[PDB]
Amino acid sequence: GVIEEYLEKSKTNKELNDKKRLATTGANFARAYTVEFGSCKFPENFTGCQDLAKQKKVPFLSDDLDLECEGKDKYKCGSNVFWKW
């Protein structure tokens, strides 16, 4: 009808947020775009090593296994049982 605005474009046409800065979606991939691992590449290292793990999803925690080795520094403890070696 109006004449006037059309209840105003940059508020009606307010889906100028199907473009805007909507890296609210988009650029949640292009930070994971570089994602890891180690990070990145190498060392530590392309599986497996993995199967299993950073990332997948899922789930699930996660840990696990001390962080390591308590035990398995040969064996553990330690300086380094003792225990007996």
């Binding site: 009606t12 046409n13 307010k14 889906e15 979606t25 988009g26 949640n28 991939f29």
Partner: protein, 61 residues
């Protein structure tokens, strides 16, 4: 009163115009099958606004 008109039998046909009516008549009711399938697209759907209509293709993120 009279009788004839037109000349033929519903000025029958013609035998390409029988085809003229064809699925120009029917394919249009193929396409109001688009109608059939709502004929709303506003499915209480919000939605087909901000106008719209469609238009997923299908973006995501």
């Amino acid at each position: 009163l009279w009788f004839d008109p037109l000349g033929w039998g519903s000025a029958s046909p013609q035998k390409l115009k029988e085809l003229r009516t064809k699925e120009i008549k029917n394919g249009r009711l193929a396409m109001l099958a688009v109608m059939g399938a709502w004929f709303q697209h506003i499915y209480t759907g919000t939605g087909p606004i901000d106008n719209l209509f469609a238009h997923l293709a299908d973006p995501g993120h």
